[model samples]
Target: ASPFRLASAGEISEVQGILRTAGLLGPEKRIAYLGVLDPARGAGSEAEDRRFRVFIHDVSGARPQEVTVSVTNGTVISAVELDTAATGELPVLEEEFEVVEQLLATDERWLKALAARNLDVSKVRVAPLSAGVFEYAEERGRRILRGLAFVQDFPEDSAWAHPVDGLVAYVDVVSKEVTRVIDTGVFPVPAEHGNYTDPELTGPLRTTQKPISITQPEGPSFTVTGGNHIEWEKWSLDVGFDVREGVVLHNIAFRDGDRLRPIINRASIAEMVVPYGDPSPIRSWQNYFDTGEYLVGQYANSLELGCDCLGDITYLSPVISDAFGNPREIRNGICMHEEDWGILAKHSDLWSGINYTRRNRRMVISFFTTIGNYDYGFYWYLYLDGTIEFEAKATGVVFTSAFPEGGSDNISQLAPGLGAPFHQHIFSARLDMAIDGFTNRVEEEDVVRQTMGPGNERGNAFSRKRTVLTRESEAVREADARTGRTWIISNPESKNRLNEPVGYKLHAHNQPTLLADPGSSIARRAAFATKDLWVTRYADDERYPTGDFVNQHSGGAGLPSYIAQDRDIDGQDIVVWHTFGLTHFPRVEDWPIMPVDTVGFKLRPEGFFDRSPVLDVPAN
Candidate 1:
């Protein structure tokens, strides 16, 4: 066991008891708990039995103070206090978020507004949604939390398919009261045919009498040792948890016979932006930086068998802290399994020699996180072909707004009285590349159309033009499928037999760039989406692309601020930030539960291997 062990129930109780005895936990305390982390980075092999660092905030005094408590085994070790202004901002806990829902549920004004719409308040599930940074509530110079009201009716079946529209609410966390409420006039209740059990939603069925099940006859092909360390064919990596980035993979390497080549040091979704397309006062400022505003890992849905994942899946639980700094384990936070990937390669030649074909199998490490109505499924696939694909699937209920006619005439009616408005989901993936070792160089390779030169006689030729990225400034690039632009992260010292540097190529396709105006407030908040790619020298502290504290932050903390340093990234350990966006113009077919819209990128071996790495592999 490593230092990052899950805290036992006894340990959690001990820490809370210590806080309460010290007068740190109380109703009148105005306290906020910021979880705990493995404080002792493990003194040695015996470090797993070490102390934990618990973080809490007390705002009852004139200035907020951050309290750090150290606990070892089941006893309180030490407690220290520091200025909150000097410490890093902690994430709001799930317990603190409960207060917002409670305030909205009991508010007389909110109930009256729902009553005016002829909707029963008791039957509705009021979700306190993120209000983004532009519309954060504040009073007397103290910032209050603000959220929109996403009220949904209790499902008649097992699913919550009801959609409530056009209501927003604000809550004062300190005062614990609903301060303001906004009614946008229209409340269109979409018909309840959105449930999965409804027969009207049936599609073309492919009937099969035999069970379609995957099995590992000789047990799993991959070897997963420790808790999260996995090894499959040629791939080896460690899966870890982050409060913001749900699943983080580290120490990613691929075995090349006797040599294990380093690929990525760490990889995760740095930030995500979902900006709504509406001009109304209540809807205009709806730009949610999900990771920054709320911890995605904290809200991860517990995966299940046969439904969420199939086959012999391994589930990993994540321990999260509550409002009182007590640990709570979120069961089945991650799922790992082996998937059948159809075909790896197939080549049949009648005139040449022989016919060759092989089936494909991949090791998948996955997790699902729900940020309000949107459910994001992130999967990391390690294929037998020495390629890793990071897939992000967005599926779930569309955040709808109210319309008089229920559905939009522009896109036709999906339901009776609801319109799923247009929006954009842009995700920034932060890749810490460690090709071979740590020192690597990034270069942009572009396929450009050649003129009527000596190299091109027909004037229809294209040539690959590679430009070395010398500084962080030149690393910013956009995906141009026409030019076949791709970035290569290569180890300058390591080369294949052909003298080409061993590297990996990153290529993304069908990515819709951000549609928001560059000068707009939403665009400013998510500057990482302004470019398709960014390369900067590795900085341990800079993990998030949208800055650390984006809840009430203006601009200037994300990729823009990191690049403003303009440090040299040439031939150095570097981090690559890639933005993948989907401009979702809602259609009629997207009503109810929208189908999965998946977009991702591939990291393929580029001269990293001498030849087809998996050509000799046997297939089952």
Candidate 2:
């Protein structure tokens, strides 16, 4: 039998060859993603059933097709067009991003606008963006994007520093038409040098700052198998990557005693939407779906060893396909290592004249990608004490625009004349959980204070109240900070030694979800971000939080459409979609490059274990 695995570089090319032999791959068509097919559907006991799925976009009719093929058998199983009748747009073509810049080079209107600002056209750079849904007739029913301008003195110099605030170009990516132009009039392109790396620009170096290096002389505490599966301490996981979701964890389990307990079947940061707050015409249409629109994994970074990750790091180079279906590997696309987290369980007993302590160790699986001006890093952690956490780090140069010397609202002044717009980076993580087994249910728990009664006349009594969410709509909830609310995912079929359902607790901090106003295009496009938690009955096809197609999408596609059936969720295989992120209100200090801002959720063993999982760790 052929065990389940990712598509290799040869298989990626072989599948495209099969598609071309079937007359599916053509000059007018492009391959979007050479993704994996589910084991139950394709990776059956029989080797012939193993297959791969590839997404193709045809420019001829602006259509998207999902085709399943077997590279081993050299045959096509099925092919279907996706949401063709509906208005949802497919992922933007890789080549289409460059076409916008090509168009701006010759477009008289954009060139004339640059001329008005005494700007050299050749020195300017174009940033193509999704022309978010609007009432503009020219942009209706078409694959269109708005190209923003910036200035770059050199290839390495930061282009984000000099912002051409006023002008915007609208182009229909499919038709190659420079359809419209919006000139909000000429404004200051921040003149100050933002080259922070330049020694002259940053002034003198700190002599007091000493260099420190990290190394694991005894090597790391983890081992790799099949170049994908990782076994670290008591944790066993499979790290996979996709063209849309950079780092995906599969078959995550913890070894406790004699048995290997499964935690999650699959988990990934499925989608992320970045929306700017300024309502000005130029800013209103700035919402970008970095994952869905530009394909985040396609832009993965080749991380440097000591610079990006310290100590003994195991790197996994994820394979992806280009616009032409050519296989490519992102060297060091994913990194895995273990770090010390102080004391795990420590106790000092003077009476017994004994001291016991165990060092806390956790394994990290991380991936970093650069999307235009911003760099994002995702870290998934597995602790020896049976705790799992997912974190997102947003760092890089802040997207900027003219200040008008903004000493004003909606924008923060980064320099004398440079301004950075206020924006929100809302990320949605689709957690396919299997606490004890596949069939599970969710419970809402809140800490409640007892009223002053005969039971507690002093009024100091407090306890937890858990409500089993039996339906879909009832499962839609938000974080209750005052009540210390958290969601419990439990397997009713699997009972713990305490005679309760084996469970896992998801801890969440207060989340300021999507800040876009209701009735706005972003509200419709990013409907999943309006709430904190969503539990839905599982379907193999249901993956993306805001549906599969995000660029120029009309909204109400992913969650809204998935839960419309509102099937029974209790004691069933389910998926948890958490919308948690940072609502960044910029500060003046977040200039040149912003410090990495982190946010995420943790899943702790609630009642899954009979006792603390790390109790057996020998005292040091």
Candidate 3:
């Protein structure tokens, strides 16, 4: 079929090329391929000459599998698949309901409105017109009847843009107006009443009174000012903070006081200042829950027994002591995070026996010690990569059947100390940490030199770089306990180690559990279990609210059996154990700025099937 199909050796090669182009010998004869930003002939086009630009597929007969590459960046937007899971149709829009209802109604006003427009009603189904406009099947039928007779307006470039408002409604072809609007309001209102109630308020606790172990040479604690980023998908985070002291211990502790003892309040929420950023930036565990939310519950083991001895607690009773002058009998407590005082329950009351685990991250730090009568510690764990794992011990009064059947509305109805019973406990609490100032990076360098080297050499500078120590409390013990059974935690050296896992089995008191049929959907139930919270789950239960887009479930059953939900006002993952006894208070020495704590999150890469789905993508 070629002009010169047979000639000299060189001629034969030219003839093969010609055949490849003419589709005689076929493309199999052609080995040359090209990389392209834009496929010259669209995604599925396979003609050889039609592609001036295209990526050579891994061709053992394996084509690029219909990929849409972005024209600007050459990134693969998506890969076409012969089979795809159903996106699962979206629930019908509220606008659709309203439109159908209005169209079907035979009321006088509706009928007149249609009649005045010279509209016929006979066999017409709902055909949307412009905003607040509607036509009928007849209109649609007419379009089909006319075929190409009706002029089609060219699409405007603006029409291709995504809608600014996430509103969706029907539009009429002729009028081009929205017929009915669906209000996907910023907040959705449920359609039915369900078992939504306030868990109970655990109270505003008094600052625990304990011996103040003051460390000298203190001024302002370390300050983490800028340049910390958290990448959710990457499961990594980064942050930089100046540590005042050469060595910083990042503390994490779970308080499990006493579960058998009856709690005197409704199931309320608590917040511990995670000074790394905002005051108690509620952990995501609260808002979006899954069964694993419990993993974040009580992790106070490191804060208490992890150290050589529990770090001393400052007594508030001295400033505002009881009439007895015994420094107001504050409960014994341990310093968990460098910034927090995890007080042990005595008269203050708390539950015990909850499990917690956490991992540590690398961070930049500077440090100093002892300001006023108290010791100050500071460090920063820069999670520039994003995900930080946090773990805690379960401590506090665990109550059963204590909630009044009356729900959240009855929260205030009960007595002060005697509000409800086993299930319903009400405790009040507050946080007041004074902000400390920032450290001068220049001055800190000089101090490290004077202490380590006589002539101030750089060698001393490295050791005194003030390692950013994160308080990754009790991981080894937890892993051991998780692997088998619980035992006494006696190893102080291992307690304060970073990225550690510790374990303990929580036992619910003999008190029976209060059960309720989670009951109905958002459409059927008007509210979340806790009215003051917006619960989201990371599991796969149909009963709980799932994660946005990902469809993860919230709360479910457990071992020591603890439940966690994010507080509604500001979604911070709040984990409370009916077991451990714990309380917190931010004092003056912790002011100008408080010290840093080892409060972070852990993300174990499981469930994900891809071998680094993001492997090809560059790290952020």
Candidate 4:
């Protein structure tokens, strides 16, 4: 494919005009502008083009419609309507939501509910819920908006962020009137005072070390090619943004001698779920697919230099369209830089009086997306040693609910009358594997115990068990550190000098999987997250792990539905889906903002090269 470029502002305006001229614009229509999707894959020599797609929610119509507009060089080619489910994109416009809260403040019913709880109407903050609430509204054939209630009474300098006691409000999105109210009875209100300030408000200083700076003697080593393409050492890739999946890497390859060999065709954050453990009305049934329900790229925080990223950095700006098709630039939406990865290799021979040492450098590309109170930082690192690493860091305020008065002794209490219940932050990564070649196979290697077989008298011994996953049905596996099990994607036609197939191994660390019951709503909604690993024969349309229309969806889509056919996967073009995350049981220290909890995996070369790729690296 040609170089992938984002839609220009003039092109967005052209598409918007074309749709408007075709009788698609009206006050009654609630248009949710899904970002530009790349056109069908073409030969590498052709120009990379884009098309715009918008989801339409007609207030008076039976269902929503998806309108696709083709554009070439700032001109609209054609506009077509595709038929599909009525799963509309739920809008969370900061401006619109602000107006919604203002309207709610005057509602008699909402005011009465607040008075009953002895809460001031103006002091309560309203935050929108996700597709879960939208699904409930659609079931009742009502156009409604739902929001979580929080108390915001503390001073401006202090952080007053705790959920209101068991209350959620439903209002008619059109009329802006309170339609229904959900009150799960009174739970105690948390303490009114607590400031997240300097010099420690509630405790001693957490750090004593003097500030240090990281620097490069001759500046960063990595370079940005065109605009979005990156070339660093032996690695190269093109980066783009999807309104849903924040950062996407395409055509990732490594330089092998004079040729660049393909490692992955595409890599993206396919889907993610944050499920709460509390069963209360406000917190229960709160398993949300963040990327699906709301646009993650749309919420990407503009990264600042030195603070968000260090070194000589190259930033890419993304042109994003609003629900009404108005275009704006998200500055510094993505950042690229090079970092020192400590010592890569070091060895000394005392007898020979010879020594060798080298400091490793890595190219890093990163972006951060905020989903409600949580901020997720996604990063990709290309090492000098032909290894690629993917990392996800979760750092944000813990979702806390109010506890009863004098409830400090409660099991869930992290703060007095404030409980941060257990939850899970699950992420799914879609890896389009093209290791060495398109036709590849995956096999599982497990380290198992061999009880003193044949020649050995001692019982403590281990053997390696290798199993080739021949079909889609057998490809699902989990992380088992106890067994030292790992998976390899390899090309059978290509072999190393040692006669082993050229391959790359998938290495995953300890991250707790979904602990919710298999039959529960949370598990059913996020089927792709139930398992840690899955492999299926490549299909272009099956890119997203939780399916396309995951908004308000129940189950029976995503990876589970795609693999239900049980297609043969051996020696075929395959895609790997890996899930990484943690089952978070929040503590008092997690309040205000949780420290960064890192969860990641690596794709390391295994017999893919004849020898260590870093052997040629200079020793300084």
Candidate 5:
């Protein structure tokens, strides 16, 4: 298979122009995503597999359409209008969010609800969220968006401060009607403005911290001479960006002496979800699929030098489609730089008076994408040693509301009336495994205490157990803190100096999966989050763990469907999926703005290396 590469800006413009000429794109339609299709479907080369995969949404037709077109020879390959019920819902666009404002302008029912509460209609702000599929008979696959109302007296005010707590408006953008409205009016609007934008609102800034400039007079040690490829120290990889899942890495390889061994072929966070916990009626159905439903990468912030990245920095801009399928680029979309990571190797000897120390540094590739009240900082790290880590920093304002009636116990009260609900940020990371080569197998290793009698004569001996995950069904696993569990994905065809399979170990933090009950509708739609680990034989169509379209999926779509194939992954080209995240119970300290709640996992080289790769560095 060919290594993954993002479609060039030239290609995006060429395809958009061709579609406009062919009447595929018009005033009423929008392009949700545009990217390159898998090259394996064609001649397994970039030249022969030059096709574009575009997702289209029609305002009038109210349907999700997939079109495959090619810039080569100007031909439309295939076009399909998927059924929303079976295939799932399309992404909610930015322009469509304005419909709620338009409808509320003259909507007597909506205006009356606000007017009764003594709320100014113009001062009200709303979060246009996707209507997660439930048994709501009227909202089942209807191309709907639910607006969660809030209040902000001024344009610069934080809307989350005074939640129009129990009020919600369900509007069908296609129908353009306020189909349903919920106005609880149970709690009073929070009066105090919760803002921390500048020194104006929160008073004078502290002068304790001084400027620590990170200037590289000698320039950067890393080079990005080519379009998207990065080469720094012993690391070399290609960076790619997608309209849905941002910050993709392809062909990650590390050099050891004369050999450049491949570690991961392709890696990205395929999908992520924020499942809200309050069991109340007006908010129970609040789970959202960020990557698939909302297009997380599309809202990427244009990063700055001193604030976002320090030291010698390099930026990569992405050419993305706007609401009307026009080409636009996010300036400084991705940030890359090197960090002084403390120490690599350190030791001091008093016996012979010989001392040698080595310093450690790492390369960071990162971006921040704002999804409503939350901004996710997606950072990937490459260490001096052969270690790769992916971190997601959850920052920004917490989705707040008026404290429930009688000061409910389910929410965290930041102020007199402002309450922050409990929730989870479940992340699904897709690692297209390629250890050394593609013939890989996963072995679950658990450090366990042997039975006391014969195996452990002293009753103090603990041994390790390794179980081979041979098939698809056998690969569905979970993290066990008791056993200190880890998965060893090895290339059976390749051997280290010790004659063992060359591989990397998958290590992660183990937390509870989806808190939704098994019988719950969210459990059905987000079945992939139920398991911590899943291994599937590599398939071109199997990219996301939660399926391609997750806006309003019924259930058992992505990982569950792929696992049903039950293909043997032992000594075969396979992809592994890991589910990890945080269960946030909001605290008083996390109120006005939430500090970054960092979560991630890492791949450490096990038998993949014969010795420590960093030992070659000269002693300082």
Candidate 6:
């Protein structure tokens, strides 16, 4: 048909009208025609003229092949089947009939339909027709993503009922139709790529900025009057400043506050905006748990910052947020008295929708610890009239020893090999925060068994000997060593309690100063390690080794030596510790007025410093 020559502006529009009348253009399409011209004068005419041709490639059947057809008067120009992976390679085929035979079986209906238009299906080259139609829109690549989805859990079981999955469906720009679907498999997990590479490539993606820290010691020794023994505790915050270079790194504390309490406010630190305003729907306005891809972005091997709580654990339960990445809470009334603690702790949190509630005002802290440390424990205060006073003493360290051959008669055990079988620990409590003193005690007589009796035959629990250090006396008191393989056995038990009033004292620093970053090497490494630790934790992989839940030496790839331990660097002791994950406890009486917590630790200099490092400055 010689491309159906057109003349003048109106004629070009007439051609588009013809195509639209034939059902080729969608209803909403607007085809604007420019003036037509002679081929001789147009410099780019040859390239533009090539648009009238067709090309085709198909690789969907038992054999891969290619075919070309014309649009003006649909006619086959080229056809072949190739075995090479390369696109340019000619697909080897025995004969044209074999290729046509395959196409006929798959597309005979379409061919027959077009046959009414006087078109031969086997002869038509589809590539040119598709190309010509897409010429103007070709620059915009087809939407590569099909349906997008997000799922909080996979295996869609009871455990995943609360947390949900996300799914998305959109038109494939290239195909010009909604021909694809993408399911975000198992939503609300660490969107981890599992990139394990050498430290070089990780430099920028993972930073070395560590929490700013310092060691402070106070007072004289008890043994000798003149002997000045300094009680040095390490204070750290996510802040970095280079005196020589211009780079200054500052961490923003987004938890319930006007802004981050300056890095300098470590102890007795107060949130800028007090009392989470009455109108503020959320009580605790800080979210420490990170979920999915957002969590993965921050995963690195070297970073340690402590945020402790069980309310926000697992990537499965991240605090949902708005488009700006702010933690959002439920829009409804703050039901302080209505929340089911049992269900909330086990199930996922109820998030407030972005459009309905104020998410910026709420945050939930997540806590994690090594496996089998203690079944589960929490600390809070209460009033007689039921005005419950809730308090959280982050985490505590209790000494442990391996299970002896003959288990201690005084200690208690749950279901031996099962790890945690008891409903709650038999411990008492008293509290004293004053200078003269208040006292909370965990009595020994209350340590009788409530559940998990003897162990299994595999010797899981009794296999390792264990003991807890008590201040009551020098006696080890035959620690609970219920190591046996059988399911039933009589476990001798006793009640346990704290020695005296064990509470943290708030000591304010006199000088208004800032701490500097430790550098990139440790910081980046710690971040990745933190992620790995979390993965191992959730997967029950193995962040804590078998010995005694000690992570300091339990070696994992990229695991650092500077965690929860005192490491001497240049005659100075540098210690860092973090508590994360969940805790499991079962009992009723333990809730309202739980025992005074056994939490926190101290990092003494222990001769690591030259002399008592001191700086005399004004107090805050």
TM-score for each prediction? 0.86, 0.96, 0.19, 0.91, 0.96, 0.18
**Native-to-model Cα distance after best TM-score fit, residue 422 in candidate 1, in Å:** 1.0
lDDT of 5 by residue, 1-620 (tens): 22355566677778888888888888877887787765563344447657888888887865668999987768778889878877887788888888887787678888888888888888888788888876578877678888888888898888888888777888888778788888766468888887887576669877899889877788878887557888888998999888899888988888877888788888999999898888776678888788988888899999998888877898999878776656789899999989888879877899988887898888999999998898999999999888899999999899887786587756788888788878899999999998987899999999977666865477778889999899998889988989999999998899989998888998988888988899898888888888899999999989888887888777788899899999999999899999998998888878788888989999899878888888888754
Over 38-139, each residue of candidate 6 has an lDDT whose tens digit, in order, gives 122223433333111111122222222333222223333344543322222211111221332233323444334334434333433211001001112322
- Candidate 2's C-alpha runs over 4 A off are 41-48, 59-62, 82-87, 405-407
**Cα error, candidate 6, residue 486 (Å):** 37
The per-residue C-alpha lDDT of model 1 at residue 363 equals 89
Question: For candidate 6, which ten residues in a row score worst on lDDT?
Answer: 269-278
- The CA-based lDDT of model 4 is what? 0.75
Poorest lDDT segment (10 consecutive residues) of candidate 4: 82-91
Error of 2 at 538 (Å): 0.3
lDDT of 3 by residue, 1-620 (tens): 21101112232233334333433333322222111111231324343221112111221233222233332332334443211111111111113323443433343443443344333444223322112001333222111100000011222211101111112233322222234333232211111111112122224544686766534245223222221222222222122111100111111111112211110111112221110111111111111111111111111112223232333222110011111111212121122122222321213224755533322233222222221111222222222122112222222211111122343322211221211111211111110100010110000011122345566765545333211111111111111122222211111112112422111112211211111223422111112221211212112221112211111121222211112432121111112112111122222222222233221223221211123222232221
Q: Can you write out model 1's per-residue Cα lDDT over 204-272, one digit (the tens) per residue?
A: 545766777877777877776777788888888888776677788887898898888889988888888
Give all candidate RMSDs, comma-separated: 4.1, 1.8, 27.7, 3.0, 2.0, 30.1
On TM-score, the stronger of 3 and 5 is: 5
Clash pairs, candidate 5, are: none
Which has the higher TM-score value, candidate number 1 or candidate number 5?
5
Model 3: how far is 582 from its true place, Å? 20
Residue 93's lDDT within candidate 4 is 44
Prediction 3 global C-alpha lDDT: 0.21
lDDT of each: 0.73, 0.84, 0.21, 0.75, 0.84, 0.20
